[PDB]
């Protein structure tokens, strides 16, 4: 179970990271 939970947790934090990236990439195309 703990492995499931942890896998989930990491996957989620992944999606959050994945979005923050995009924002920065947008910021680039817009600034630089």
């Amino acid at each position: 179970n703990l492995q499931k939970i942890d896998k989930d947790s990491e996957e989620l934090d992944s999606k959050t990271r994945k979005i923050l990236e995009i924002l920065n990439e947008c910021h680039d195309e817009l600034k630089a």
Partner: protein, 63 residues
């Protein structure tokens, strides 16, 4: 026949020149009111828009 049915449909027949002259006056007024309402609304929406935009600007990556 046609010319009558048309004369019946002809607008203004029953109404007076006064019953009209005011009806126009009113519409003129109720019309200003509605535009000020429109203006205001427009402003409030653009403020709302400015809000959203601000948010979106702060989510950008790159300086």
């Amino acid at each position: 026949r046609q010319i009558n049915k048309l004369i019946d449909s002809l607008p203004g027949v029953d109404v007076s020149a006064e019953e009209q002259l005011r009806k126009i006056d009113m519409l003129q007024k109720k019309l200003v009111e509605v535009e000020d309402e429109k203006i205001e609304a427009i402003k409030k929406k653009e403020k709302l828009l400015r809000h959203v935009d601000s948010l979106i600007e702060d989510f950008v990556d790159g300086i």
